[PDB]
Amino acid sequence: QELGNANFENFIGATEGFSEIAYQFTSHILTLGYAVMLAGLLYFILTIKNVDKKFQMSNILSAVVMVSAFLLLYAQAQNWTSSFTFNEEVGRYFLDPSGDLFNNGYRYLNWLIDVPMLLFQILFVVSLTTSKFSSVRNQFWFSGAMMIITGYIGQFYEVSNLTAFLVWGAISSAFFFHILWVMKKVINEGKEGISPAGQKILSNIWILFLISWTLYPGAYLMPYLTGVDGFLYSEDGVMARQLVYTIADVSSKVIYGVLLGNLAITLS
Amino acid sequence: QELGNANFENFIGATEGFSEIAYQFTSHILTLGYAVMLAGLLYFILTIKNVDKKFQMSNILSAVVMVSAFLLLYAQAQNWTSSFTFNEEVGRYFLDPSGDLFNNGYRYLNWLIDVPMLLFQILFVVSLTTSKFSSVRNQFWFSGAMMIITGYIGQFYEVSNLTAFLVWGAISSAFFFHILWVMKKVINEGKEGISPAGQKILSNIWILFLISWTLYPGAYLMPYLTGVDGFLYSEDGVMARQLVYTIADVSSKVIYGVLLGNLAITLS
Amino acid sequence: QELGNANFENFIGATEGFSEIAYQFTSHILTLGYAVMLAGLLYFILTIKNVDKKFQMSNILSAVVMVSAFLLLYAQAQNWTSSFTFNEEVGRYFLDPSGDLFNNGYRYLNWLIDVPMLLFQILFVVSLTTSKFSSVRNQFWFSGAMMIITGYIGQFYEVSNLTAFLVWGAISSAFFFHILWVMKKVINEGKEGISPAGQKILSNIWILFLISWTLYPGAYLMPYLTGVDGFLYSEDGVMARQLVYTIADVSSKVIYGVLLGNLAITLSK
Amino acid sequence: QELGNANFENFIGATEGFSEIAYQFTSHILTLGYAVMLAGLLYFILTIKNVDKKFQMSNILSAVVMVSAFLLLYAQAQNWTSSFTFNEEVGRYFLDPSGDLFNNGYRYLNWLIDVPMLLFQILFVVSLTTSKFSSVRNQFWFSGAMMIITGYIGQFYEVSNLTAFLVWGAISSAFFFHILWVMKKVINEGKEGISPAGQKILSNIWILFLISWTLYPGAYLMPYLTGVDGFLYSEDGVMARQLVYTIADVSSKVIYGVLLGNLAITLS
Amino acid sequence: QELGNANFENFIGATEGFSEIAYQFTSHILTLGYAVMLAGLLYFILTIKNVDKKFQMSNILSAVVMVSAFLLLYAQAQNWTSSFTFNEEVGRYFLDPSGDLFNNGYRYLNWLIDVPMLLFQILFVVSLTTSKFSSVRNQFWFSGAMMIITGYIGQFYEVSNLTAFLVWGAISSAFFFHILWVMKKVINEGKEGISPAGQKILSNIWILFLISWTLYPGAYLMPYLTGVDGFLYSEDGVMARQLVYTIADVSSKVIYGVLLGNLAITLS
Ligand SMILES: CCCCCCCC/C=C/CCCCCCCC(=O)O
Ligand SMILES: CCCCCCCCCCCCCCCCCCCC
Ligand code: NA
Ligand code: NA
Ligand code: NA
Ligand code: NA
Ligand code: NA
């Protein structure tokens, strides 16, 4: 069977197949994913009037991200269930090519919305002391775009060409480190001239940002984190990857948005 | 045939099949389920301005839960109809593997939204006395998560491994008892310093909470409540399980939310 | 072919099949059905601020009913088209078992929302005199639930067991008569102490309620209203049943809601 | 092949089939149709507060019509694509019976919403002089209903029985002429006691009403407007019918609604 | 195989087929497309109260365009996935005629909404000096309609008849040049008598308009921009065409709308 430049989920699905637990769990975690985003959308719209006019752009950009996340995770949930079909003889779900191959790439291109907006929205709550608003925004947007596009190219080769996969991943990581650098500056300048309560929240935001954003490259490498022919190059790795994505999505978008809202309230 | 770690609905559907009444009833009760949640969503949004600003977070969290419940029950209703197909020769609906196996697990993972939010929202209406807000919240959220996750693991073995099914269920019950304990404290502290009218409503809320939340473990054990090869290990048990879930869902989310709203009005 | 405890639509569909007119008409009337409910939802939300705060719960409960009706009629419309497939050799639509058997039961269980809310909402516009609010509400809700549940059980036997069908229908009718009784009291007490304009509207509401609610038991008996092998035990009866349901749904929910809104306006300052 | 009392689209689709242009164009025009209605819905809701309270019922009834039109045109667009399937051997789309026969009847029954509401809404903007509000409303609603129902019956026989088709069409036309008569009176009385600017708009509304409403009977006769076995009794007539419907739908509902709104602003 | 007057995507899909990257990328870019439009819809509605009453029509028309774009790009995304199916023997996606042929024509007919509204909305923010409002509007609407209709006819022949394709394209370009002419005048008159800030934004709007609108004819010619049997007459050209459309859609509708909103704020 010829799959070409396809994600490893298809190789596991085409050879070993997926147990009821592996298939159902992946279906459930992706379903919880889009449910959280639509719930978040409602929360961000309904709490818009809870902060001063100047901070409301944060709620609006959170809502924008929720729409992106909901549509993508909904599409990705349908893509999962249509790509793997139950075989009654062996009692496992195997690649059903009529449903198309499964691809994580859907997520990557929608990050062209999420990443720029998530980085932009904090600049509407915090006050910079040294750094220029337009300069920070432009660095976030340029590095964000390059990080996503290079990673998008890389993930197509996660099985067909391990070398390209790692090189593109490495280039992508360079832009990621730059984003972490600039965000650290923004957090530090943001802490200057606000109440200790506000400073505590910004500290929490930095930890959340650091861990949640790092999970994405984790999901990228997931199948190989226990090396070639490891425990994770199986249905277990498939489950782990989608679980990690869902934890990252909720943390980086919904919880991040809630914390920014709480900061906005303390500064109001 | 080989089903593996699948819910008992699939075993009944694969062997005996479902009569028109059993199949249609299950379809109708799940349809009523999601209809009630979307109707509730509209009610909670439209009555937001009927309570003082400080109580409006209760309406908002009810709305959040309604979105979760609607999406899940809608998906679960489609999963039911796609998993069982009519056999014209015998006049019964049999497992159709091309629609995937039916799994109640969808509900469990969405409880990661419902349970934490349902427990949290009462803390925006009642005033604690001796207990700390953050302490009660953290206990609810930790015990809630552990209760759900342990039960989620257990239900995959309700047929393939009765021992694992009961052990995980037992561990889950421990966390359930802790939640009941903390909620009892919250209700008692909540009754302190409010009108007898408010105290009457809180008393009703406690009864509703107790009965409605107990129905869930009831649904878990349903197939075995009349022992192995009992009256309930049949299409009758399948009907009973989904009926009990629907009664529990409407009571625990919609009716609970309405009572909290009425309490909020009394305190306004 | 073995169908069991199935609605008569499936027996006609499995034996005679449906002409283009019968199949298309049923599809069109169910489509109009859900379209009216979504349009009504928008109307009730957009006119909320046209009445005093105390009457706004009427608009809200109308909206709640519209959501229920829309979702159910939309589902029922899809169920119809998926259950009957065209046979090119004879030019008729026949039962397609892969789409599931057609069942009217979907409606019945959603009435557990509609009936209680429709009866409850009038108590937010009219003022009772000799009757207690909680007492009337409880009678409406208990009798409403029993009426629906008994009818739901009955309709599964409309072909497989005519006796069970009629017995459950009869029991259901008892609870229906009780509802009509209580509603009559509510209308009379509602007329007391309001302008003749308001009394006129309440009179219209009573007529609408009486006719529209009676259509439902009419739809129940439809296949047998011309006897066991009659004109109506055909695709004509299938068309008639869904037509009557749609007329009853629009009248009992949408038009009823509009009249209550107009009453609320007349009582408003 | 036996089709019975079916629309002529099915006869062309079953014999000649449809070229890529004919099939795609019909799909595109119906898609544009429902897109316009959802866009209009948004416009009528967002401009509600642009007119005095007394004229807002016009926006509300426009919105009601948009919901009707959107749902129907969306359904009709799906019905078209599911009823005709590509034959790779000859490169044309042929009747696919598994998708059901195509029927324009969907439109007719939804006119039971559109026609009464479109006629009613003008009575909330203009002031009658000689005529009674209730009398005009009742004539519009009775004649509207009879016009639609008689036409609905007629269109089922547009191929199977040309005589019935024309007789029902003729009876329907009688009720149409009555509506045109009453609307003319309403326009004239509406012009009395308003600014020349308002009178100009009412003049435009009358022209729009006359042309747009006449297109519907045009669509009815379309297949026979060049006689039996004419140029239009082909895929060309199929294209022309759906094009004319779309032009009529946009003009009679959306543009009509906009003009009434502009009149309401002039009178505010 | 006989395709007739079909888009070149179908010819590549029927002969060479599409690699995983080509098929997935096209699916991802179209998905990002509709996601951006629904996110934009939310942004334009939520920021309506950020500008003076007289400028709010701009937000409303942006919202109207977003509804059009969302519905069309959503439909086009579904059309793409249903028209090409994976062949497990060769590992490529081939034309699946049961899903209908793919056609870009969907976009063209929805431009009958987008183009007129995009050109109209700027006239609600800028003040004309020498030019008459009604005159400019009428020229935009007439030339817009003719540009779209002529291009719509042309694209059906992009493979079956290269001559017709180029002639209709040329006629269409004439109307395009007229639009560019009128828009240049509007921008110049708009710049007269407003703040430096306002003039800067109008300058940006003109550049964005010029580049973004030119991309559309670029997408039209895409398959032949490297001559007959060139590098772009392949799956690479298919990818490039949909990519260019998506860049043009986001720029011409969303970014254009945001800039107009920012101009409205500076003038408020
Ligand atoms: C598929 C159904 C899911 C519906 C949920 C989608 C959410 C989109 C937002 C809609 C609700 C927001 C309405 C604005 C709040 C009104 C404020 C108020 O009434 O006080
Ligand atoms: C591929 C590009 C994705 C970007 C589009 C995201 C969705 C549209 C939302 C628009 C975002 C606007 C950003 C705010 C502009 C700041 C202007 C200042 C106002 C005071
Ligand atoms: Na599957
Ligand atoms: Na089924
Ligand atoms: Na069908
Ligand atoms: Na087709
Ligand atoms: Na495909």
GROMACS .gro file of N, CA, C and O in nm, chain E residues 91-135:
model
  180
 1164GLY      N    1  -0.160   0.559  -0.457
 1164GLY     CA    2  -0.142   0.655  -0.346
 1164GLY      C    3  -0.160   0.799  -0.389
 1164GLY      O    4  -0.083   0.885  -0.344
 1165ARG      N    5  -0.260   0.825  -0.474
 1165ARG     CA    6  -0.295   0.961  -0.523
 1165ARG      C    7  -0.447   0.975  -0.524
 1165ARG      O    8  -0.517   0.872  -0.529
 1166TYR      N    9  -0.496   1.099  -0.518
 1166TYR     CA   10  -0.640   1.133  -0.523
 1166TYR      C   11  -0.678   1.158  -0.669
 1166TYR      O   12  -0.612   1.241  -0.735
 1167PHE      N   13  -0.780   1.088  -0.718
 1167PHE     CA   14  -0.830   1.098  -0.857
 1167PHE      C   15  -0.973   1.150  -0.858
 1167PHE      O   16  -1.046   1.136  -0.757
 1168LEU      N   17  -1.012   1.212  -0.970
 1168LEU     CA   18  -1.149   1.264  -0.991
 1168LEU      C   19  -1.248   1.154  -0.953
 1168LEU      O   20  -1.235   1.042  -1.003
 1169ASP      N   21  -1.340   1.186  -0.862
 1169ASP     CA   22  -1.454   1.099  -0.824
 1169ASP      C   23  -1.580   1.165  -0.877
 1169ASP      O   24  -1.634   1.255  -0.813
 1170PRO      N   25  -1.630   1.123  -0.995
 1170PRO     CA   26  -1.742   1.191  -1.061
 1170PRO      C   27  -1.874   1.192  -0.981
 1170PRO      O   28  -1.955   1.280  -1.005
 1171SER      N   29  -1.892   1.097  -0.889
 1171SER     CA   30  -2.013   1.085  -0.804
 1171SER      C   31  -2.024   1.207  -0.711
 1171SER      O   32  -2.136   1.234  -0.662
 1172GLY      N   33  -1.913   1.278  -0.689
 1172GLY     CA   34  -1.908   1.399  -0.604
 1172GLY      C   35  -1.928   1.526  -0.686
 1172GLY      O   36  -1.921   1.636  -0.628
 1173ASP      N   37  -1.954   1.510  -0.816
 1173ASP     CA   38  -1.966   1.621  -0.915
 1173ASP      C   39  -1.826   1.666  -0.954
 1173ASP      O   40  -1.731   1.636  -0.880
 1174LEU      N   41  -1.813   1.734  -1.068
 1174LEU     CA   42  -1.685   1.797  -1.111
 1174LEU      C   43  -1.663   1.919  -1.021
 1174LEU      O   44  -1.763   1.977  -0.974
 1175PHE      N   45  -1.537   1.954  -0.995
 1175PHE     CA   46  -1.501   2.076  -0.919
 1175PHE      C   47  -1.515   2.195  -1.014
 1175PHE      O   48  -1.480   2.182  -1.133
 1176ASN      N   49  -1.569   2.307  -0.964
 1176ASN     CA   50  -1.590   2.430  -1.044
 1176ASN      C   51  -1.569   2.552  -0.954
 1176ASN      O   52  -1.626   2.555  -0.844
 1177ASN      N   53  -1.489   2.648  -1.002
 1177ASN     CA   54  -1.455   2.774  -0.931
 1177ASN      C   55  -1.570   2.874  -0.947
 1177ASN      O   56  -1.570   2.976  -0.877
 1178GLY      N   57  -1.666   2.843  -1.036
 1178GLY     CA   58  -1.783   2.927  -1.069
 1178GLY      C   59  -1.862   2.970  -0.947
 1178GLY      O   60  -1.924   3.078  -0.952
 1179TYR      N   61  -1.865   2.888  -0.842
 1179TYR     CA   62  -1.931   2.919  -0.713
 1179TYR      C   63  -1.886   3.058  -0.666
 1179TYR      O   64  -1.973   3.142  -0.636
 1180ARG      N   65  -1.755   3.080  -0.662
 1180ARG     CA   66  -1.691   3.209  -0.623
 1180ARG      C   67  -1.748   3.325  -0.706
 1180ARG      O   68  -1.791   3.426  -0.647
 1181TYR      N   69  -1.746   3.309  -0.838
 1181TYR     CA   70  -1.783   3.414  -0.937
 1181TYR      C   71  -1.921   3.471  -0.904
 1181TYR      O   72  -1.932   3.594  -0.888
 1182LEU      N   73  -2.023   3.385  -0.894
 1182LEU     CA   74  -2.164   3.429  -0.873
 1182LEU      C   75  -2.179   3.496  -0.736
 1182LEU      O   76  -2.262   3.589  -0.726
 1183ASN      N   77  -2.102   3.455  -0.635
 1183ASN     CA   78  -2.108   3.516  -0.500
 1183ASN      C   79  -2.037   3.653  -0.502
 1183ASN      O   80  -2.064   3.734  -0.411
 1184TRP      N   81  -1.953   3.679  -0.602
 1184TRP     CA   82  -1.888   3.812  -0.621
 1184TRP      C   83  -1.995   3.916  -0.656
 1184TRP      O   84  -1.968   4.036  -0.637
 1185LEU      N   85  -2.111   3.872  -0.705
 1185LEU     CA   86  -2.227   3.959  -0.735
 1185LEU      C   87  -2.276   4.024  -0.604
 1185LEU      O   88  -2.348   4.124  -0.612
 1186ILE      N   89  -2.238   3.966  -0.490
 1186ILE     CA   90  -2.263   4.026  -0.355
 1186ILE      C   91  -2.139   4.108  -0.317
 1186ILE      O   92  -2.152   4.230  -0.297
 1187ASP      N   93  -2.024   4.041  -0.310
 1187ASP     CA   94  -1.896   4.095  -0.257
 1187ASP      C   95  -1.857   4.225  -0.328
 1187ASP      O   96  -1.844   4.328  -0.260
 1188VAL      N   97  -1.839   4.220  -0.461
 1188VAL     CA   98  -1.785   4.333  -0.542
 1188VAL      C   99  -1.871   4.458  -0.524
 1188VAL      O  100  -1.819   4.563  -0.487
 1189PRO      N  101  -2.003   4.453  -0.551
 1189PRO     CA  102  -2.088   4.571  -0.534
 1189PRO      C  103  -2.082   4.631  -0.392
 1189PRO      O  104  -2.077   4.752  -0.380
 1190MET      N  105  -2.082   4.546  -0.289
 1190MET     CA  106  -2.085   4.589  -0.147
 1190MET      C  107  -1.948   4.646  -0.107
 1190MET      O  108  -1.946   4.747  -0.035
 1191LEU      N  109  -1.838   4.584  -0.151
 1191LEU     CA  110  -1.700   4.628  -0.120
 1191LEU      C  111  -1.676   4.768  -0.178
 1191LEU      O  112  -1.612   4.851  -0.110
 1192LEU      N  113  -1.724   4.792  -0.300
 1192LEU     CA  114  -1.709   4.921  -0.372
 1192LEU      C  115  -1.800   5.026  -0.309
 1192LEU      O  116  -1.757   5.141  -0.292
 1193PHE      N  117  -1.922   4.987  -0.273
 1193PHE     CA  118  -2.027   5.074  -0.215
 1193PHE      C  119  -1.984   5.126  -0.077
 1193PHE      O  120  -2.002   5.246  -0.051
 1194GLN      N  121  -1.929   5.038   0.008
 1194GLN     CA  122  -1.906   5.067   0.152
 1194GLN      C  123  -1.807   5.182   0.172
 1194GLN      O  124  -1.824   5.255   0.272
 1195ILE      N  125  -1.708   5.200   0.084
 1195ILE     CA  126  -1.606   5.308   0.099
 1195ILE      C  127  -1.676   5.445   0.089
 1195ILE      O  128  -1.627   5.540   0.153
 1196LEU      N  129  -1.787   5.453   0.015
 1196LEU     CA  130  -1.864   5.578  -0.009
 1196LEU      C  131  -1.937   5.623   0.118
 1196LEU      O  132  -1.996   5.733   0.115
 1197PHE      N  133  -1.934   5.543   0.225
 1197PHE     CA  134  -2.001   5.574   0.354
 1197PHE      C  135  -1.898   5.629   0.454
 1197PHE      O  136  -1.939   5.675   0.563
 1198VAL      N  137  -1.770   5.627   0.416
 1198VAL     CA  138  -1.657   5.669   0.504
 1198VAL      C  139  -1.594   5.796   0.447
 1198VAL      O  140  -1.571   5.890   0.525
 1199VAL      N  141  -1.566   5.799   0.316
 1199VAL     CA  142  -1.502   5.915   0.248
 1199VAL      C  143  -1.610   6.011   0.199
 1199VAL      O  144  -1.725   5.967   0.179
 1200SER      N  145  -1.573   6.138   0.183
 1200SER     CA  146  -1.658   6.246   0.125
 1200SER      C  147  -1.607   6.279  -0.015
 1200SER      O  148  -1.487   6.314  -0.028
 1201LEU      N  149  -1.693   6.263  -0.116
 1201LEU     CA  150  -1.662   6.299  -0.257
 1201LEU      C  151  -1.664   6.452  -0.268
 1201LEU      O  152  -1.736   6.516  -0.189
 1202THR      N  153  -1.587   6.508  -0.361
 1202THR     CA  154  -1.578   6.654  -0.385
 1202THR      C  155  -1.647   6.686  -0.518
 1202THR      O  156  -1.760   6.738  -0.513
 1203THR      N  157  -1.584   6.651  -0.630
 1203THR     CA  158  -1.633   6.682  -0.767
 1203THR      C  159  -1.734   6.576  -0.814
 1203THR      O  160  -1.832   6.615  -0.880
 1204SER      N  161  -1.712   6.449  -0.779
 1204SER     CA  162  -1.794   6.333  -0.825
 1204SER      C  163  -1.925   6.322  -0.745
 1204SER      O  164  -1.926   6.359  -0.626
 1205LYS      N  165  -2.032   6.274  -0.810
 1205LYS     CA  166  -2.165   6.252  -0.748
 1205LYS      C  167  -2.172   6.109  -0.693
 1205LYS      O  168  -2.134   6.015  -0.766
 1206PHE      N  169  -2.219   6.094  -0.569
 1206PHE     CA  170  -2.233   5.965  -0.496
 1206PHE      C  171  -2.303   5.861  -0.584
 1206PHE      O  172  -2.246   5.752  -0.606
 1207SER      N  173  -2.424   5.893  -0.631
 1207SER     CA  174  -2.513   5.804  -0.710
 1207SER      C  175  -2.444   5.762  -0.841
 1207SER      O  176  -2.461   5.646  -0.883
 1208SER      N  177  -2.370   5.854  -0.903
 1208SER     CA  178  -2.299   5.832  -1.032
 1208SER      C  179  -2.188   5.728  -1.012
 1208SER      O  180  -2.182   5.631  -1.092
   0.00000   0.00000   0.00000
